[PDB]
Amino acid sequence: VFALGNNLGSTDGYLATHSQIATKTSKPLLETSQTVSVITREQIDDTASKTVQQAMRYTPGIFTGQVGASNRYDYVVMRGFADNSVDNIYLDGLKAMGDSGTFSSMQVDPYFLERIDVLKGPSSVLYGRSLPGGLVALTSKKPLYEDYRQITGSIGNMGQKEMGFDFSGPLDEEKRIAYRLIGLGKGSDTQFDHVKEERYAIAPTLAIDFSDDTTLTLQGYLQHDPNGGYHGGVPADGTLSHHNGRHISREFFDGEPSKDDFDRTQRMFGYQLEHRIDDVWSARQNFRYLDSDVDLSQVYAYGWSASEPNKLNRYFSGAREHLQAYIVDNMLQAEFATGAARHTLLTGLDYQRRRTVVDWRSGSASALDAFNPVYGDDAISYFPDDNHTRRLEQTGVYLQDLIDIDQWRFSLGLRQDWVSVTDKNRSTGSKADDDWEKFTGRIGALYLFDNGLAPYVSYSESFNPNAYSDASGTPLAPTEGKQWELGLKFQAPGSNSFYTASLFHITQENVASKEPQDNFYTSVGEVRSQGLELEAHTQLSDNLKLLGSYTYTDITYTKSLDGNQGHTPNQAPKHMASLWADYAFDAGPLSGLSIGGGARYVGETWADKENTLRVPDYTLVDARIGYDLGKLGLKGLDVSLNANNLLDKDYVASCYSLDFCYFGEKRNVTATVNYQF
Numbered sequence: 001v002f003a004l005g006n007n008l009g010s011t012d013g014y015l016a017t018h019s020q021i022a023t024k025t026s027k028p029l030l031e032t033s034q035t036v037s038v039i040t041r042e043q044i045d046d047t048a049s050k051t052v053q054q055a056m057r058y059t060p061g062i063f064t065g066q067v068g069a070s071n072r073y074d075y076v077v078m079r080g081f082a083d084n085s086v087d088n089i090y091l092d093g094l095k096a097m098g099d100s101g102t103f104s105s106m107q108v109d110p111y112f113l114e115r116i117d118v119l120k121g122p123s124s125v126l127y128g129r130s131l132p133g134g135l136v137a138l139t140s141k142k143p144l145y146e147d148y149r150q151i152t153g154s155i156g157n158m159g160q161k162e163m164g165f166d167f168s169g170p171l172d173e174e175k176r177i178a179y180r181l182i183g184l185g186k187g188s189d190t191q192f193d194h195v196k197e198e199r200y201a202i203a204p205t206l207a208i209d210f211s212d213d214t215t216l217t218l219q220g221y222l223q224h225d226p227n228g229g230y231h232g233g234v235p236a237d238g239t240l241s242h243h244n245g246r247h248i249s250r251e252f253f254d255g256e257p258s259k260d261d262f263d264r265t266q267r268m269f270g271y272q273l274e275h276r277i278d279d280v281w282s283a284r285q286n287f288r289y290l291d292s293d294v295d296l297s298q299v300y301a302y303g304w305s306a307s308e309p310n311k312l313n314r315y316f317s318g319a320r321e322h323l324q325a326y327i328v329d330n331m332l333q334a335e336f337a338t339g340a341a342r343h344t345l346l347t348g349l350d351y352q353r354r355r356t357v358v359d360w361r362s363g364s365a366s367a368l369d370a371f372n373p374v375y376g377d378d379a380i381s382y383f384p385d386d387n388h389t390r391r392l393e394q395t396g397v398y399l400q401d402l403i404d405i406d407q408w409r410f411s412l413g414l415r416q417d418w419v420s421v422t423d424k425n426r427s428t429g430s431k432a433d434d435d436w437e438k439f440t441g442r443i444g445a446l447y448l449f450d451n452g453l454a455p456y457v458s459y460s461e462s463f464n465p466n467a468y469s470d471a472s473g474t475p476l477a478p479t480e481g482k483q484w485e486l487g488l489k490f491q492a493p494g495s496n497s498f499y500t501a502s503l504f505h506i507t508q509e510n511v512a513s514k515e516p517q518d519n520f521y522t523s524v525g526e527v528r529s530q531g532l533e534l535e536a537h538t539q540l541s542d543n544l545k546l547l548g549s550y551t552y553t554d555i556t557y558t559k560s561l562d563g564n565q566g567h568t569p570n571q572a573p574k575h576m577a578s579l580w581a582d583y584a585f586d587a588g589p590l591s592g593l594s595i596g597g598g599a600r601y602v603g604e605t606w607a608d609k610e611n612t613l614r615v616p617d618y619t620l621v622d623a624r625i626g627y628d629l630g631k632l633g634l635k636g637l638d639v640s641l642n643a644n645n646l647l648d649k650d651y652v653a654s655c656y657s658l659d660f661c662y663f664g665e666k667r668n669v670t671a672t673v674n675y676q677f
């Protein structure tokens with residue numbers, strides 16, 4: 001039923017049986033030599049996660065707090081590696097292709113997805129450039145071959161309101177052409193004064209069966225965000241502590257209302273072609289093109305002003321960016337036997353190409369009182385403009401073999417990569433132009449016991465182009481990740497329960513390092529991240545689903561010129577844990593009702609790489625109640641009330657440095673109505 005490039009599992013409540021993310025071909029999680037979590041549509045809905053980042057808050061090895069209550073972009077820190085977290089997202093097989101070094105990172109609304117898979121650790125062997133911590137792969141909704149219709153409505157605090165629809169179905173008498181059309185409109189004042197978020201999006205999709213051997217899928221995703229919510233940060237002095245006498249509200253807005261814009265338009269046109277050649281061979285081509293636009297205009301705080309007492313030193317930052325990008329992945333796979341051994345041999349060739357045109361304005365703004373701001377003084381005092389064109393190109397050739405034999409599952413992969421990047425400075429004339437070729441390998445071995453236990457060991461690699469440069473303005477060499485993972489998976493034969501343990505050790509080399517006086521880097525640092533991840537999904541009866549996680553992460557700088565040579569980076573909790581439970585009353589008095597709840601604990605973190613100051617820990621509580629009106633004669637209609645951060649904690653979710661600390665989201669309460677067919 002076509003495994004190449006599909007998950008092809010089966011899902012039941014919060015638990016899926018298979019995935020494609022570690023292998024690029026459907027494999028049962030139990031027989032897969034990597035740590036892989038999967039978050040279902042149902043999980044996303046039950047926790048009322050507004051955002052792919054928020055949707056990961058019950059998953060071990062993941063930190064969701066990088067910018068606190070900001071929703072503009074999706075920051076997912078994996079296994080301690082925060083440094084280019086916007087780039088961890090892949091969509092229908094293919095990297096998202098935002099440009100991490102500009103304001104043009106892309107955002108996928110969760111209403112368009114059906115699933116989210118997380119793969120832990122270095123993963124370049126099938127994806128090219130990526131992070132040492134791993135990757136997140138989103139799977140979008142697809143056309144259906146029986147008629148389906150949903151309409152959905154939401155109201156909330158902070159002025160939240162959402163409407164959305166989702167029609168799918170067969171288009172022809174013979175059920176070989178199918179559509180899906182998904183639309184939404186969405187808005188929020190946030191917790192923060194004078195800010196809106198706003199989105200309108202629509203996703204059409206056509207699915208065409210060609211002979212008995214081919215499917216073609218045409219895809220669009222048009223999204224427009226006329227407002228970007230909030231993306232500010234404030235000093236730790238006055239947030240984790242008192243500044244002179246005061247404390248700095250979690251509703252505080254560091255900008256100017258008359259100069260705060262964030263307008264993002266993102267359009268994707270894509271296709272997936274699946275083709276069966278023989279009983280042995282399959283091919284598959286995935287492709288997507290992205291044309292984005294960002295206009296941005298903001299005044300933002302950078303520390304206390306040194307001459308004015310209770311006011312924040314502030315700057316301006318404008319941008320107009322046009323990004324155009326494309327990505328294609330070609331795969332050819334064979335299923336054949338050599339004696340006792342089953343082989344699944346994959347080769348493929350991918351190609352990425354990205355151009356981004358960026359006109360950046362900047363300058364200084366009047367200072368602003370941090371407790372009793374007076375807005376209005378929006379005159380900017382401009383610095384020199386800074387205009388660039390930026391291109392990247394990556395090309396990969398890769399080979400994988402999955403060898404099955406007796407109770408062993410083995411895994412081999414190689415990949416050759418070619419990366420070119422170039423920056424034209426249209427303001428000063430100058431040009432950077434640099435290219436690297438990289439080789440990556442992965443090897444895994446798992447053993448599948450008769451009773452449902454599956455120990456596995458795995459070795460694996462990543463590379464990623466370095467964000468930083470040397471004294472001559474040349475980029476540093478790419479960073480290299482290497483990981484040994486040792487893991488244990490369990491599912492009892494009968495049950496719908498699943499358990500996982502992973503011990504891992506990751507090394508990151510070529511990390512940028514600077515002597516504090518210097519303003520240019522050298523690639524001479526190293527980071528080591530090791531820890532333990534536990535994950536439980538339990539069906540305790542037919543009415544009760546549980547998810548449990550625990551995460552121990554010891555990440556430090558094992559080599560650093562900055563003076564931080566045994567420190568833990570910021571945004572890296574030593575401990576995290578979570579627990580979520582949904583109860584659905586079967587029969588009796590409360591039939592149709594559902595209650596669920598959860599708790600998430602995040603340990604203390606450092607505010608700074610110097611480790612001079614702690615961010616306190618926090619436990620947040622989320623809750624829900626739902627009712628199925630099908631019980632009472634209105635089949636398909638149901639209704640829910642959700643609350644995240646039920647106890648309305650103030651807290652600093654994290655800091656990026658002592659100058660930039662971020663508040664966690666306050667209590668968020670959404671009530672929802674869905675009518676199906």
Ligand SMILES: CCCCCCCCOCCOCCOCCOCCO
Nearest residue numbers: 153154155161162639640641671672673
């Ligand atoms: C279990 C108790 C809670 C159940 C409450 C169910 C009712 C849900 O109402 C939400 C429907 O409202 C959505 C309307 O939003 C858009 C309309 O406004 C236009 C804005 O210009």
Ligand SMILES: CCCCCCCCCCC[C@@H](O)CC(=O)O
Nearest residue numbers: 183184200201202222223224265
């Ligand atoms: C109900 C959902 C509303 C749909 C929102 C999508 C907005 C996308 C803007 C696309 C504009 C270009 O296509 C027009 C052009 O080239 O001039």
Ligand SMILES: CCCCCCCCCCC[C@@H](O)CC(=O)O
Nearest residue numbers: 328330349350351393394395418
């Ligand atoms: C086996 C045949 C492949 C099927 C056709 C797909 C070709 C994809 C074009 C990619 C362009 C790069 O190659 C350019 C390069 O960086 O050199």
Ligand SMILES: CCCCCCCCCCC[C@@H](O)CC(=O)O
Nearest residue numbers: 349393394395397418419420435
């Ligand atoms: C059968 C396998 C054929 C493989 C074709 C490999 C082509 C790779 C060269 C293109 C790489 C660009 O991103 C950078 C560049 O070339 O400057």
Ligand code: NA
Nearest residue numbers: 034035120121
């Ligand atoms: Na892994």
Ligand code: NA
Nearest residue numbers: 197198225227
């Ligand atoms: Na938004």
Ligand code: NI
Nearest residue numbers: 226263264265
């Ligand atoms: Ni616009």
